[PDB]
């Protein structure tokens, strides 16, 4: 398809916009992680439920470092 390619182009644009938004909101994610989060709230899930998970998981990897 052709419009599916330009749609995919626009999804790269949106994930780069979200990458700018993440880097000046200065989160611990990289690109590939926030992609997985975008999958999570594309299907519909709580950001307040994901945030507590990411907030202890980033603290449970400095606990045995």
């Amino acid at each position: 398809a052709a419009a599916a390619a330009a749609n995919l182009n626009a999804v790269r644009e949106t994930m780069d916009v979200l990458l700018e938004i993440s880097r000046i909101l200065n989160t611990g994610l990289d690109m590939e992680t926030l992609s997985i989060c975008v999958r999570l709230c594309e299907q519909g899930i709580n950001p307040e439920a994901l945030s507590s998970v990411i907030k202890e998981l980033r603290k449970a990897t400095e606990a045995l470092k």
Binding site: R39, I45, A49, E56
Partner: protein
């Protein structure tokens, strides 16, 4: 897709544990994500951006707030996402300073004075 299998990918992205190695944190993750899957606060992709703009004026980086208005406009220009409130609310929740009070600045609707 399935939301349950996607949860372990986050646990292997954050911690370096392998997928058959991390089953404790994903067990806890089923506890927090499960039965907290439906929204408890009203959806607002507009208000979350208007509260980041409030923060950006409060830090007196007013040129970056007008940069964020452009980023919000590009977000609206593409329009591929289904829920744009959730990822921005998620980025706001996990915030840290790049480098006071918010009890007098407004929160959002409780869905009890709104619809349950």
């Amino acid at each position: 897709k399935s939301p349950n299998v996607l949860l372990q990918n986050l646990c292997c992205r954050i911690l370096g544990r392998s997928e058959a190695d991390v089953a404790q944190q994903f067990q806890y993750a089923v506890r927090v994500i499960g039965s907290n899957f439906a929204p408890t606060v009203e959806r607002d992709e507009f208000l979350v951006a208007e509260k980041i703009k409030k923060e950006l004026i409060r830090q007196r980086r007013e040129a970056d707030a007008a940069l964020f208005s452009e980023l919000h406009r590009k977000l609206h220009s593409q329009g591929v996402l289904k829920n744009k409130w959730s990822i921005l609310y998620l980025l706001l929740s996990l915030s840290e300073d790049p480098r006071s009070y918010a009890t007098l600045f407004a929160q959002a609707l409780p869905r009890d004075a709104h619809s349950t």
